[PDB]
Amino acid sequence: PRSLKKGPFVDDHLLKKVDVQNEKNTKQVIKTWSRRSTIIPDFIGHTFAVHDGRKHVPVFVTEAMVGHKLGEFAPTRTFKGH
């Protein structure tokens, strides 16, 4: 994992998006492409349409998934069996 001195990494795009989203206390679906951004306690209510490679899948954050990255909840490869 990332070193603690550098601190958590969040892209500026969705960071600004969530600051303007939470300043009026309503959470609309936020369409993002940055699967590398970690989850901050500022995301607890917001629903993210994280990219997958083909489409954007809705991700609703909770308390538990803080500290993970948005990409962990958008599975890329699809496998059903042989």
């Binding site: 603690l4 601190g7 958590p8 306690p41 308390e63 998934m65 803080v66 500290g67």
Partner: peptide, 11 residues
């Protein structure tokens, strides 16, 4: 709670 652990790590 995970949020507490974040506060420990980064604060």
């Amino acid at each position: 709670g995970r949020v507490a652990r974040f506060e420990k790590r980064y604060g």
